[PDB]
Amino acid sequence: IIPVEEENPDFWNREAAEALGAAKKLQPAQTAAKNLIIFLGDGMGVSTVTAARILKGQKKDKLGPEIPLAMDRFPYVALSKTYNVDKHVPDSGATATAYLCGVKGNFQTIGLSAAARFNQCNTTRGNEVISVMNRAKKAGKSVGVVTTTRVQHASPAGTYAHTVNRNWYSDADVPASARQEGCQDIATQLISNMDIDVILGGGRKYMFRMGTPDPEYPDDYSQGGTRLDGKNLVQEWLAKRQGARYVWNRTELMQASLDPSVTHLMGLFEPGDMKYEIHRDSTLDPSLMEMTEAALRLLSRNPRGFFLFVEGGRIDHGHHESRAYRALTETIMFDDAIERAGQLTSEEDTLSLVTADHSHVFSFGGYPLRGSSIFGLAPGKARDRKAYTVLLYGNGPGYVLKDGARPDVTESESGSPEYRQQSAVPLDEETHAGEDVAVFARGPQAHLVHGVQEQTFIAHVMAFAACLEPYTACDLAPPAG
Amino acid sequence: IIPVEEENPDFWNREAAEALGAAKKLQPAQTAAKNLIIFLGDGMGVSTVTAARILKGQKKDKLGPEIPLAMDRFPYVALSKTYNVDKHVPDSGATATAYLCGVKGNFQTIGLSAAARFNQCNTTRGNEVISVMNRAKKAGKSVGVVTTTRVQHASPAGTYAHTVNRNWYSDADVPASARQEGCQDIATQLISNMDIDVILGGGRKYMFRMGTPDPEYPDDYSQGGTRLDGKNLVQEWLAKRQGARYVWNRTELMQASLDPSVTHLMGLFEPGDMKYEIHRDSTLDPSLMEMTEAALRLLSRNPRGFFLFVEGGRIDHGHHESRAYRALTETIMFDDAIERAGQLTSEEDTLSLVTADHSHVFSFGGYPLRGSSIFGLAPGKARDRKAYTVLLYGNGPGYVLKDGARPDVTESESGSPEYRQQSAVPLDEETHAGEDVAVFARGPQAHLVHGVQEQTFIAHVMAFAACLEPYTACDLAPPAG
Ligand SMILES: *[C@@H]1O[C@H](CO)[C@@H](O[C@@H]2O[C@H](CO)[C@@H](O)[C@H](O)[C@H]2NC(C)=O)[C@H](O)[C@H]1NC(C)=O
Ligand SMILES: *[C@@H]1O[C@H](CO)[C@@H](O[C@@H]2O[C@H](CO)[C@@H](O)[C@H](O)[C@H]2NC(C)=O)[C@H](O)[C@H]1NC(C)=O
Ligand SMILES: *[C@@H]1O[C@H](CO)[C@@H](O[C@@H]2O[C@H](CO)[C@@H](O)[C@H](O)[C@H]2NC(C)=O)[C@H](O)[C@H]1NC(C)=O
Ligand SMILES: *[C@@H]1O[C@H](CO)[C@@H](O[C@@H]2O[C@H](CO)[C@@H](O)[C@H](O)[C@H]2NC(C)=O)[C@H](O)[C@H]1NC(C)=O
Ligand SMILES: O=[N+]([O-])c1ccc(O)cc1
Ligand SMILES: O=[N+]([O-])c1ccc(O)cc1
Ligand SMILES: O=[N+]([O-])c1ccc(O)cc1
Ligand SMILES: O=[N+]([O-])c1ccc(O)cc1
Ligand SMILES: O=[N+]([O-])c1ccc(O)cc1
Ligand SMILES: O=[N+]([O-])c1ccc(O)cc1
Ligand SMILES: [Ca+2]
Ligand SMILES: [Ca+2]
Ligand code: NA
Ligand code: NA
Ligand SMILES: [Zn+2]
Ligand SMILES: [Zn+2]
Ligand SMILES: [Zn+2]
Ligand SMILES: [Zn+2]
Ligand SMILES: [Zn+2]
Ligand SMILES: [Zn+2]
């Protein structure tokens, strides 16, 4: 459908004149960031952003592509080069090292320079690289990690952990030789490496000994504690800190976030990853936006400021399943969390970056009409006289042959939350993609986010803006009020 | 392969410190642009840029992803929203209207507001929108159109034409009713609508009457003149301008570009589109870079400045064939042309923008090792135990079944210049994609290119920077020396 207002060139000329006016008003801050926030859309590449924009636009009864996402409103954009040192198409662990520690790493390691080697515990020591979050804590800021995945998953683990193997969630995962060599599982590192004021997301099971019933699924043994070392890491964490609280559901999270006596908060809301937003039990589980707000309630108390990591962690997972419906609905909630954080913080003193760790082989094609559903069929048949979808994957589990041929697809089928878009190459999981991802920035020193940069730039600009090591001589004035 | 220097965190910290230093040195100009250049990579989306970067990096005996393209060096980046008014995934005609005229249009029209309708001649008048190039000419600047496609193709036609049908290359293409209604073919518009100082690219055949042997292929009738109205548009164009020259080969182009008496130059080097760079006869045909330099030789003579359109027009065509080798080699030549123009002009007085009209359903995935060929196989087999490539398409003519199954692929096969990467959906031509594309900018007012913008912003910022209508009250100082 052609929106009538857009048929008039004045519509476009007025918009562009407004855009030019806004562009001219942008001025660099001479002042430091008090607070730092990184919003990480796991797998949220450029095709994901545009597709999610269209879906969100239509969610609010618009045509789609013309309505800005909250992230679209950020004044400064750069492209981020995501390659790992050893692989062109990266993973979440080693990208986390880049955007959180400022150093590129090898595929599937976390918080380590590329002198380390995947799954080789004895290459760990000397190669630890300290995150901006760690440095923020050292400078007396409060720090928070918020994600829809396990809090021990690769991305949040980049804020605190150093490991040659992202798969080492608990001691149960670590081979005997590595345990002997002192490579700690990620759950242990979470509570041991540094003080973290707010930890919210999934990953209950890795904190408790085998045999410990999950409080939410006490009748499902597979959801229970995983630990073989008898440790209760939650009790250990609580024992270290006066004013610490542990919660596992939304109601207790709410109570904790408003409780003045709570100085440290760990909320682990599922045994593993949190449910997709479309599957979330809104009585039992907080959304990413709600967790973001809860984190901000506590972190904002510190007069020295805070560093906050917020991850739309299951965007990635949706794409891996080649279920664009899941990827894009996760992306919208991620954008909602960005929007919410923007309402609760000031760009006068808070540097916010939105980025992705890497992309996916997700494409948005065919020649669909303005206003058509992103989950719809491309107009016109394929060469095999069957329909095809506007959303497709290069590879992944949506590749199908029924009776020796590519299957036809209907609108009702293509629009289902369980539908897997077709791909060229069958894989159990669709792959990451290696093309550049966007970095969006707002706040003090955000104007430094520009051009095409190595992904490591994200960590460095954040440390610089807050005058953290190695940029204590930042020569910036104190944060603005 | 893991490059040893990158194993040291100091490598990444030094690079980022340098990047921060460079970012801090950026300052906005208070002065206007004397010259304007738009480099348009047709179909050159973010996945194309990254893949081309890797290929070019390796061309210069590097590992790939770490080596900047010339476009990567531009300080200012924005994302450009490419939707047409009527379709989410756009074509070249209506995107051309956006980035060259500053107004969005309907799919397959050129230089017209979205009040016009495709292939409806009687909806043309009143809906013409004037290009920045036209306005530059009106302001006394010299103007040039350079492309590897037909000069009557959708993208260059956006600089000068207004038509409800991009397919109307010559009068032979225009239906009787539209001819009667005065909708002129694009070849006629090229010579009639405005004075253009330099016109270089393909499209000889549309300028000459049926029966006219092509000078380069005098024995191939299909390459001969197409016109049914008896007009020789080249003679007509020459007759209008003292100091005008027409050339059809590289040798004459060279002579013309150095000839002080040549004020107007039309070089039409193939009957239709120019050959792919990998097929170019370097005695008979200039490369895009060579055409760019030839245009700059003449355009730079005008003390008032110039507007130059330079198109990597066959990037798009490579992707349509699902032959990434062609798409990416075209992209590298496009980047070479950008680099060359940067050597021949000053960023003190020249605003250069590099962008794409839209993207393609091209993806770069699997988990290939650092330094591996972009045309290689992904490590590890697909679920069907056969190999697959790191480059894939969502749809297009690379979809194959041999004996009822997806074919295996070898490195020798995947690396061939004729190889079509596999897709999910068979189509005679792979489709454009609708995700945002990059805009790179350098020069006076380039800092205004920021954030996420409608594609129309590209035209507007260019007009503004040069103080052209509608921005004659730009309030900028005269261009810098
Ligand atoms: C990490 O430990 C591994 C495993 O013991 C070491 O690999 C051995 O190295 C020796 C000498 O090069 C070889 O002869 C063995 O075959 C290797 N063993 C295995 C099982 O791979 C490795 O040298 C250690 N690395 C460091 C940095 O100490
Ligand atoms: C959220 O978690 C809290 C804390 O564990 C749960 O509160 C317990 O509820 C059980 C069953 O009603 C009671 O026996 C205990 O008195 C409560 N413990 C505490 C420390 O308050 C609460 O049930 C959970 N909410 C939901 C919906 O499951
Ligand atoms: C452009 O010309 C077309 C073709 O003549 C016009 O379409 C006709 O419109 C009348 C009245 O609405 C219909 O009854 C006919 O069936 C149409 N003819 C065809 C062949 O489509 C159209 O109205 C014209 N548009 C303008 C702006 O004048
Ligand atoms: C490039 O074009 C020029 C101009 O048309 C060609 O020059 C002509 O060559 C023919 C054949 O040798 C001569 O009969 C004419 O004297 C030339 N015409 C002019 C006006 O110079 C030239 O041959 C072309 N080059 C190539 C390699 O084909
Ligand atoms: O970390 N990752 O995304 C991975 C891990 C293993 C693998 O085979 C491919 C990708
Ligand atoms: O022994 N276990 O792992 C158990 C025991 C009881 C229960 O409700 C859940 C798990
Ligand atoms: O815990 N929190 O801060 C919350 C919880 C729920 C909600 O809707 C908003 C904020
Ligand atoms: O202009 N285009 O890119 C087109 C034209 C026709 C079509 O069916 C699809 C795409
Ligand atoms: O009549 N024709 O179209 C012709 C005639 C002669 C020739 O060499 C080429 C084309
Ligand atoms: O015509 N030109 O300006 C040229 C032609 C060829 C070349 O290699 C460089 C410039
Ligand atoms: Ca739960
Ligand atoms: Ca030729
Ligand atoms: Na393992
Ligand atoms: Na036609
Ligand atoms: Zn990831
Ligand atoms: Zn993640
Ligand atoms: Zn992933
Ligand atoms: Zn195009
Ligand atoms: Zn084009
Ligand atoms: Zn195209």
CA of B291 to the centre of ligand 10 (A): 6
For residues A252 and B235, what is the distance between their CA atoms, to the nearest angstrom?
A: 83
A450 contacts A80 by C-beta, under 8 angstroms? no
Residue A342: its H or E element? helix A324-344
Three-point CA angle B264, B461, B298, nearest 5°: 15
Residues paired with A112 in a beta bridge? A128
| CA-wise closest residue to B295 among B257, B247, B249 | B257
| CA-wise closest residue to B336 among B375, B290, B294, B278 | B290
Helix (H, G, I), strand (E, B) or coil at A202: strand
Radius of gyration of chain A, Cα coordinates, nearest whole angstrom: 22
For residues A81 and A453, what is the distance between their CA atoms, to the nearest angstrom?
A: 6
Burial class of residue B174 in the structure, from the number of CB atoms within 10 Å of its CB (0-12 exposed, 13-18 middle, 19+ buried): buried
Query: Hey, CA dihedral for A321, A324, A330, A331, is it positive or negative?
Result: positive
For residues A312 and A315, what is the distance between their CA atoms, to the nearest angstrom?
A: 6
| CA-wise closest residue to A187 among A161, A216, A148 | A161
The amino acid at residue B415 is G
Q: Which residues contact A312 (CB under 8 A, 6 or more apart)?
A: A39, A40, A41, A42, A44, A148, A288, A330, A331, A333, A334, A337
Q: Whose CA is nearest to atom 2 of ligand 4?
A: B249
Q: Going along B291-436, which residue ranges are E strands?
A: 306-312, 350-356, 359-360, 362-364, 391-395, 423-425, 432-433
CA of A432 to the centre of ligand 17 (A): 6
Phi-psi region of B111 (alpha: psi -120 to 50; beta: other; left: phi over 0): left
B266 contacts B240 by C-beta, under 8 angstroms? no
Residue with tokens 């990620």: A186
- 3-state class percentages of chain A: helix first, strand second, coil last, to nearest 5: 35, 20, 50
Q: Going along A357-451, which residue ranges are E strands?
A: 359-360, 362-364, 391-395, 423-425, 432-433, 437-442
Which residue in the set B129, B365, B405 is minimally distant from A395, CB to CB?
B365
Which residues of A participate in the annotated binding site for Zn(2+)? 42, 92, 316, 320, 357-358, 432
Biggest CA-to-CA distance, chain A? 72
The amino acid at residue A451 is G
The amino acid at residue B177 is S
| CA-wise closest residue to A358 among A430, A419, A441, A423 | A430
Task: Sort out which chain B residues have CB atoms less than 8 A from A55's CB and list them.
Answer: none
Of A87, A91, A118, A360, which is best to mutate to test ligand 5, by the most ligand atoms within 8 angstroms of its C-beta?
A91
CA-nearest residue to A439 within chain B is: B451
Q: Does A19 touch chain B (CB under 8 A)?
A: yes
| CA-wise closest residue to A18 among B464, B133, B446 | B464
| CA-wise closest residue to B313 among B206, B441, B154 | B154
For residues A326-356, one letter each, b for 16 or more C-beta atoms within 10 angstroms of the residue's C-beta and e for the rest, the string is: bbbbbbbbbbbbbebbbeebebebbbbbbbb
CA of A88 to the centre of ligand 15 (A): 14
For residues B44-81, one letter each, b for 16 or more C-beta atoms within 10 angstroms of the residue's C-beta and e for the rest, the string is: bbbbbbbbbbbbbbbeeeebbbbbebbbbebbbbbbbb
- Name the experiment that determined this structure: X-ray
For residues A359 and A413, what is the distance between their CA atoms, to the nearest angstrom?
A: 25
For residues B11 and B284, what is the distance between their CA atoms, to the nearest angstrom?
A: 46
Residues written for chain A: 481
| CA-wise closest residue to B54 among A326, A87, A65, A444 | A87
Cis upstream peptide for A470 (omega within 30°): yes
Three-point CA angle B77, B83, B87, nearest 5°: 165
Tell me which residue range forms the domain holding B42.
Answer: 1-481
Calculate the alpha carbon distances from B378 to A90, B6, B59, B410 in Å. Answer: 13, 23, 20, 11
Helix (H, G, I), strand (E, B) or coil at A257: helix
Burial class of residue A358 in the structure, from the number of CB atoms within 10 Å of its CB (0-12 exposed, 13-18 middle, 19+ buried): buried
B149 contacts B314 by C-beta, under 8 angstroms? yes
Write out the DSSP string of A69-102: PTGGG-SEEEEEE---SSBSS--HHHHHIIIIIS
For residues A229 and A144, what is the distance between their CA atoms, to the nearest angstrom?
A: 27
Three-point CA angle A210, A428, A425, nearest 5°: 165
Q: Whose CA is nearest to atom 22 of ligand 1?
A: A122
Query: Hey, CA dihedral for A284, A285, A289, A295, is it positive or negative?
Result: positive
Tokens of A321: 């399943």
For residues A163-173, one letter each, b for 16 or more C-beta atoms within 10 angstroms of the residue's C-beta and e for the rest, the string is: bbbbebbbbbb
For residues A363 and A394, what is the distance between their CA atoms, to the nearest angstrom?
A: 8
Q: How far apart are the first and last CA of chain A?
A: 47
Residues written for chain B: 481
CA A25 to chain centre: 31
Q: DSSP secondary-structure letter at A368?
A: P
B243 contacts B261 by C-beta, under 8 angstroms? yes
| CA-wise closest residue to B15 among A45, A186, A104 | A104
Active site residue A92: yes
CATH code of A323's domain: 3.40.720.10
The resolution, in Å, is 1.6
Tokens of A375: 């989950």
CA B304 to chain centre: 25
Task: Sort out which chain B residues have CB atoms less than 8 A from A107's CB and list them.
Answer: 367
Tokens of B415: 């690396």
Q: Does A128 touch chain B (CB under 8 A)?
A: no
Alpha helices in B276-322 (DSSP H): 288-299, 315-320
For residues A49 and A328, what is the distance between their CA atoms, to the nearest angstrom?
A: 8
Helix (H, G, I), strand (E, B) or coil at B143: strand
Query: Hey, CA dihedral for A40, A45, A46, A47, is it positive or negative?
Result: negative
Tokens of B350: 């020249």
Residue with tokens 């397959």: B108
Q: Whose CA is nearest to atom 3 of ligand 5?
A: A91
B33 contacts B349 by C-beta, under 8 angstroms? yes
Tokens of A362: 């997700």
Residue with tokens 């926030």: A37
For residues B328 and B50, what is the distance between their CA atoms, to the nearest angstrom?
A: 10
Tokens of B383: 């679920």
Write out the DSSP string of A411-437: HHHHTSTTPPPPEEE--SSPPEE-S-E
For residues A275 and A282, what is the distance between their CA atoms, to the nearest angstrom?
A: 11
Three-point CA angle B127, B98, B41, nearest 5°: 140
| CA-wise closest residue to B78 among B448, B338, B449 | B449
B367 contacts A107 by C-beta, under 8 angstroms? yes
Quick one: how many helices (H) and strands (E) in chain A? 14, 15
Q: Does A35 touch chain B (CB under 8 A)?
A: no
The amino acid at residue B108 is Q
Q: Report how many domains make up chain A.
A: 1
B48 contacts B41 by C-beta, under 8 angstroms? yes
Residue B24: its H or E element? helix B9-25
B447 contacts B76 by C-beta, under 8 angstroms? yes
For residues B93 and B105, what is the distance between their CA atoms, to the nearest angstrom?
A: 8
Calculate the alpha carbon distances from A42 to A157, B324, B368 in Å. Answer: 13, 27, 20
Give helix A288-299 / helix A324-344 axis angle, nearest 10°: 30
Q: Does A407 touch chain B (CB under 8 A)?
A: no
For residues A19 and B80, what is the distance between their CA atoms, to the nearest angstrom?
A: 13
Q: Which residues contact A329 (CB under 8 A, 6 or more apart)?
A: A55, A276, A277, A278, A318, A417
| CA-wise closest residue to A200 among A128, A266, A273, A126 | A266
The amino acid at residue A23 is A
Tokens of A118: 């995947």
CA B16 to chain centre: 32
B267 contacts B234 by C-beta, under 8 angstroms? no
Residues paired with B392 in a beta bridge? B363
| CA-wise closest residue to A95 among A169, A14, A41 | A41
CA-nearest residue to A380 within chain B is: B427
| CA-wise closest residue to A111 among A90, A95, A88 | A95
Q: Whose CA is nearest to atom 10 of ligand 8?
A: B91
Residues paired with B414 in a beta bridge? none
For residues A28 and A475, what is the distance between their CA atoms, to the nearest angstrom?
A: 14
Tokens of A449: 């986010």
For residues A448 and B73, what is the distance between their CA atoms, to the nearest angstrom?
A: 15
Contacts 24+ apart (CB under 8 A), B253-258: B253/B200, B253/B286, B253/B290, B253/B291, B253/B294, B254/B286, B254/B294, B256/B294, B257/B293, B257/B294, B257/B297, B257/B298, B258/B297
Alpha helices in B154-281 (DSSP H): 154-157, 176-180, 186-192, 233-240, 250-257
Phi and psi at residue A77, to the nearest 5°:
-130, 140
Q: Does A434 touch chain B (CB under 8 A)?
A: yes
Calculate the alpha carbon distances from A12 to A66, A297, B98, B113 in Å. Answer: 12, 41, 9, 10
| CA-wise closest residue to A398 among B379, B378, B424 | B424
Which residue in the set B47, B66, B432 is minimally distant from A435, CB to CB?
B47
Cis upstream peptide for B470 (omega within 30°): yes
The amino acid at residue B416 is S
The amino acid at residue B221 is Y
CA B218 to chain centre: 29
CA-nearest residue to B52 within chain A is: A435
